[PDB]
Write an enzyme that holds these catalytic residues in place. Structure first.
Site, PDB file in Angstrom:
ATOM      1  N   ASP A  35       0.800  -1.208   0.000  1.00  0.00           N
ATOM      2  CA  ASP A  35       0.000   0.000   0.000  1.00  0.00           C
ATOM      3  C   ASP A  35       0.840   1.268   0.000  1.00  0.00           C
ATOM      4  O   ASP A  35       1.341   1.648   1.054  1.00  0.00           O
ATOM      5  CB  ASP A  35      -0.883  -0.041   1.266  1.00  0.00           C
ATOM      6  CG  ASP A  35      -1.867   1.098   1.421  1.00  0.00           C
ATOM      7  OD1 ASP A  35      -1.949   1.936   0.507  1.00  0.00           O
ATOM      8  OD2 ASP A  35      -2.548   1.158   2.471  1.00  0.00           O
ATOM      9  N   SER A 199      -1.085  15.924 -11.643  1.00  0.00           N
ATOM     10  CA  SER A 199      -1.343  15.511 -13.020  1.00  0.00           C
ATOM     11  C   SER A 199      -1.593  16.748 -13.849  1.00  0.00           C
ATOM     12  O   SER A 199      -2.165  17.716 -13.356  1.00  0.00           O
ATOM     13  CB  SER A 199      -2.545  14.571 -13.098  1.00  0.00           C
ATOM     14  OG  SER A 199      -2.837  14.237 -14.448  1.00  0.00           O
TER      15      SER A 199
HETATM   16  N1  LIG Z   1      -7.950   3.040   0.512  1.00  0.00           N
HETATM   17  C1  LIG Z   1      -7.599   1.949   1.400  1.00  0.00           C
HETATM   18  C2  LIG Z   1      -8.583   1.173   1.991  1.00  0.00           C
HETATM   19  C3  LIG Z   1      -8.220   0.114   2.802  1.00  0.00           C
HETATM   20  C4  LIG Z   1      -6.870  -0.153   2.952  1.00  0.00           C
HETATM   21  F1  LIG Z   1      -6.455  -1.172   3.757  1.00  0.00           F
HETATM   22  C5  LIG Z   1      -5.936   0.643   2.323  1.00  0.00           C
HETATM   23  N2  LIG Z   1      -6.326   1.646   1.566  1.00  0.00           N
END
Ligand SMILES: Nc1ccc(F)cn1
EC number: 3.4.23.22
Length: 330
Positions: A35, A199
């Site tokens: 992430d 952007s």
């Molecule tokens: N936008 C998000 C939603 C859940 C997550 F675990 C990470 N990012």
């Protein structure tokens, strides 16, 4: 050093991507959601409330001879989708596709919210945003990328997500065979802890390119592309029968539609998202109304270049002294 791992969509809609991560000694392999919009490496574990685990692989720190409890450390995080998790912290050896970090903070979940429990495919998250967002208290911890950076051949990581297919996360190098043309680099602001960039504009299908500044974040942890209401309305106005549904929570469109592409600008360069990438299938099982992959950021406070946008490009997250983002077509 370098690292290279395959990232795989969790389902037929690419709702998220999982990448295997080795933790502890002997290795315990968990499939984490990499992430770039968060900075905590957290996992489902032997400490997670029993009723909140439903099919996930757990990390058991008592079975790792290199795991050390980080005394008095706790973590608690809340995400943009309303989900949350919290617990305690260990330091342990973490490896991603050959690249190893010793003493990485591994946040063990004691509690997770319903959406995490309900998704058996995701064993936790591996945060790749800036370490300033890390929730560990009272001593903030560094991300896997931040810990590995000095050891990498180049201080970068790359995201090459696939459309309905596996992709790759590389650390420490740029694979010149993974993209076409050249990589266009653009300025990053780290003030909000994100890979935040601007952007240069957009186009809808074969339409005229609109030069307009769109500040947003490159976020592999968000599924969809969240853009200003004016831009999203211009996109869905090209699809017959499309409309913003308050009951569904966004733009929906007839599943029988063939969607136009969406182009976004990176400096003078253009990334084209094919129309099929914007189809997220029926709103409920068996429905002929489909959920759109481009949604309004009006309720968020920030524009989000999520997987819908990032999967159309080879993306360089450059952690040099002054971080930047690179985008190339592929
Ligand atoms: N936008 C998000 C939603 C859940 C997550 F675990 C990470 N990012």
């Amino acid at each position: 050093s370098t690292g290279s791992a395959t990232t795989t969509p969790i389902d037929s809609l690419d709702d998220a991507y999982i990448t295997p991560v080795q933790i502890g000694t002997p290795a315990q392999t968990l499939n984490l959601d990499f992430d770039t919009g968060s900075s905590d490496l957290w996992v489902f574990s032997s400490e997670t409330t029993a009723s909140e685990v439903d099919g996930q692989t757990i990390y058991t720190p008592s079975k790792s001879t290199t795991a050390k409890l980080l005394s008095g450390a706790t973590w608690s995080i809340s995400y943009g989708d309303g989900s949350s998790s919290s617990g305690d912290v260990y330091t342990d050896t973490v490896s991603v596709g050959g690249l190893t970090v010793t003493g990485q903070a591994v946040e063990s979940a004691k509690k997770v919210s319903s959406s995490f429990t309900e998704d058996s495919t995701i064993d936790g998250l591996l945060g790749l945003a800036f370490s300033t967002l890390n929730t560990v208290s009272p001593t903030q911890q560094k991300t896997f990328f931040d810990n590995a950076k000095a050891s990498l051949d180049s201080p970068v990581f790359t995201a090459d997500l696939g459309y309905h297919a596996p992709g790759t996360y590389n650390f420490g190098f740029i694979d010149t065979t993974a993209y076409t043309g050249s990589i266009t680099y653009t300025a990053v602001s780290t003030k909000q802890g994100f890979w935040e960039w601007t952007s240069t504009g957009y186009a809808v299908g074969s339409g005229t390119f609109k030069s307009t500044s769109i500040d947003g974040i490159a976020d592999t942890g968000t599924t969809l592309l969240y853009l200003p209401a004016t831009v999203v309305s211009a996109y869905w106005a090209q699809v017959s029968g499309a409309k913003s549904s308050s009951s569904v929570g966004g733009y929906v469109f007839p599943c029988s539609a063939t969607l136009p592409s969406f182009t976004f600008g990176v400096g003078s360069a253009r990334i084209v998202i094919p129309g099929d990438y914007i189809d997220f299938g029926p709103i409920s099982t068996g429905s002929s109304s489909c959920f759109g992959g481009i949604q309004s950021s009006a309720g968020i406070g920030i524009n989000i270049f999520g997987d819908v946008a990032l999967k159309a490009a080879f993306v360089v997250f450059n952690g040099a002294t002054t971080p930047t983002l690179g985008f190339a077509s592929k």
